[PDB]
Amino acid sequence: VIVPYREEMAKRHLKVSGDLGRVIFMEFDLRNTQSIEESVRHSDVVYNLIGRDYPTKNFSLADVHIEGTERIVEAV
Amino acid sequence: AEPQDGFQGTRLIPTGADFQSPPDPFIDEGEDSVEGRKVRHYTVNFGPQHPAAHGVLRLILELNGEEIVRADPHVGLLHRGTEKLCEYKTYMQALPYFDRLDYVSMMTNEQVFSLAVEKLLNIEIPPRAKFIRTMFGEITRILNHLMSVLSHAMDVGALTPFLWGFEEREKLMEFYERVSGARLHAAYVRPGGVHQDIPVGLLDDIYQWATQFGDRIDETEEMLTDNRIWINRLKGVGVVSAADALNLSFTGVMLRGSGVPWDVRKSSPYDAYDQVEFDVPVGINGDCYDRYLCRMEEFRQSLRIIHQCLNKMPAGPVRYEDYKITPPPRAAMKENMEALIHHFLLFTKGYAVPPGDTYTAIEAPKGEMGVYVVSDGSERPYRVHIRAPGFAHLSGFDHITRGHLLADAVAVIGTMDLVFGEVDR
């Protein structure tokens, strides 16, 4: 499982799920294309669970959902 | 004709209940009335999450207000299956498992397993190994008592002696690292003697530490022995009579505190303890205060033995001189055919131990440590059972604490020298 993350302390619980070498963490920003497709080029299945119910200073709902999906789906 | 005789249940087997003799009555010394009202006890769990005195200890107590009704220690939080693992190891490979039982008394732990294997091997180890092992035995006894007495003192509030004495631990841990390459798990005492000889400047460095250690003991006694808070915390606490201590399987200080003069080093001498002079501290009231005074005097007798070992240290080899049991020197292994073969076989197959069984006991710092080994003639032991003094001592916690104050339980947990690697194994 490749897990692209933003905060290190937030993703710490995910490692317990798998054996050694099974849960892999990747530093990523949704506006860093290199990071998105470095996280995807080896995968045979990609889940997009990126969503947000509120807009933020850095991301409009369209920025995180529409532009977010579009960069990920193009990498896929 | 068991066990088919039990298929239909004939001839029940006699229990201890079937042999209860009525006491001799001549000489035997032993409405809404509020006296019939019952009292509800509350059962409190102590440990291991909620802080306890030390270690992986879940202590389940039934209390009547402030008094202990029933004490029920739950152990096995550090049960690691050591005894089973030893059956899949050679005797060499099982030796480090003994460092990790009473893990402040490493060299005497490995001493008891070496003596038992040496007994089944039918070999007499060289005199220099005997003196090194006795010397490191009393160094390890001081290391243990420094941990035991001072951490017991720290549990009842006395912060400072623990700090002073653990610098003494640091000095003696350097001697462990100089001989082996480890602060704690030396794997130094092996069947046949010790791994390697001591470096050529160690005896003098031990001697220099010895000239100042008496003052360290004395300054510890300046804060505790006459202190009225220390006495009021220990005197009359955790009393066990001499008769019950024997029936509860108490050994070491837990036995000598009740007045019984008994030391395994005196009763069944091993290594070089028959060649050294020392006294055995014995208490008279069987309480935490007597056991504290015995342990403080054991500090001085250990130092007294170490000084004798420094002067009586003979020359010669430190490993039994048969390369069929002990590994040859590395220069021999690279030089002649016979030595290289014996090196190859000892590190792949291991030495074969003649079949049989033995129970071997030593006076460990926490009391009588024993090991029961069964040999099948092969290079792996058939059975290794370890007799830990802390196991017998903690099994007596209910007997010594029932009817007494909850505020004295920390005193008797510390008066038993309790490391749970010993207890659970």
Binding site: - | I27, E29, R40, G65
Partner: protein, 81 residues
């Protein structure tokens, strides 16, 4: 579970003794005018409350003695009948 009566005693003896100390504080700021005559009454008052503390101590309502080999059998040989 039942609670310990010693907690009620500590609060009870504290309160009653706290009141008596309070009643002596006016004397300490009035000693000059009170002189000998006021001192007598203060000493009478102290003596009376001291007796109740003796009762406290003598009966050990705080359980002072809370925590604590003569043989009843003696045998005599008389011999053969």
């Amino acid at each position: 579970s039942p609670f310990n009566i010693s907690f009620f005693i500590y609060g009870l003896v504290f309160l009653l003794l706290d009141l008596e100390i309070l009643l002596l504080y006016p004397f300490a700021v009035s000693e000059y005018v009170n002189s000998a005559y006021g001192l007598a009454a203060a000493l009478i008052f102290i003596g009376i409350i001291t007796i109740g503390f003796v009762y406290e101590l003598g009966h050990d309502a705080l359980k002072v003695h809370s925590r604590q080999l003569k043989s009843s059998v003696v045998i005599s040989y008389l011999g053969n009948i």
